[PDB]
């Protein structure tokens, strides 16, 4: 059985079993948003999505 | 109306709200090619390779 993975950036829709931790903002936290891993600080965004 | 797409490089302009308001087709004519090379919609007087 050959499992072919396609690793795109935005649309994941397939993630392994992991616990959804509560949101923490306004401090340096290593987030992981559908694989998007990076150290940063969370802030309210006012841009038109 | 029915048209056909082709592989073409484009220069897209994003506004403050992230909506495409203008675009340049690089292969349309030499002026658009110069705009693509300079990565700007405004080109000053001069000679550009
Ligand atoms: C962006 O959206 C805001 C929302 O009110 C608007 O005032 C502004 O004119 C928009 N800018 C555009 C569409 O370039």
Swiss-Prot record, chain B:
UniProt-annotated glycosylation sites, renumbered to this chain: 17
Region (Putative superantigen): 15-36
Intrachain disulfide bonds: 26-36
Quaternary assembly: Binds to host ACE2. RBD also interacts with the N-linked glycan on 'Asn-90' of ACE2. Cleavage of S generates a polybasic C-terminal sequence on S1 that binds to host Neuropilin-1 (NRP1) and Neuropilin-2 (NRP2) receptors. Interacts with host integrin alpha-5/beta-1 (ITGA5:ITGB1) and with ACE2 in complex with integrin alpha-5/beta-1 (ITGA5:ITGB1). May interact via cytoplasmic c-terminus with M protein. May interact (via N-terminus) with host bilirubin and biliverdin, thereby preventing antibody binding to the SARS-CoV-2 spike NTD via an allosteric mechanism.
Its biological purpose: Attaches the virion to the cell membrane by interacting with host receptor, initiating the infection. The major receptor is host ACE2. When S2/S2' has been cleaved, binding to the receptor triggers direct fusion at the cell membrane. When S2/S2' has not been cleaved, binding to the receptor results in internalization of the virus by endocytosis using host TFRC and GRM2 and leading to fusion of the virion membrane with the host endosomal membrane. Alternatively, may use NRP1/NRP2 and integrin as entry receptors.
Protein name per UniProt: Spike protein S1
Gene behind the chain: S
First-to-last residue of the parent protein present: 266 to 314 of 1273
């Amino acid at each position: 059985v050959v499992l072919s993975f396609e690793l795109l950036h935005a649309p994941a829709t397939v993630c392994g079993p992991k616990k959804s931790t509560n949101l923490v903002k306004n401090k340096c936290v290593n987030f992981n948003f559908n694989g998007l891993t990076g150290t940063g600080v969370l802030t309210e965004s006012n841009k038109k999505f | 109306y029915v048209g056909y797409l082709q592989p073409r490089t484009f220069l897209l302009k994003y506004n403050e709200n992230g909506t495409i308001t203008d675009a340049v087709d690089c292969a349309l004519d030499p002026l658009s090619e110069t705009k693509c090379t300079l990565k700007s919609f405004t080109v000053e007087k001069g000679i550009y390779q």
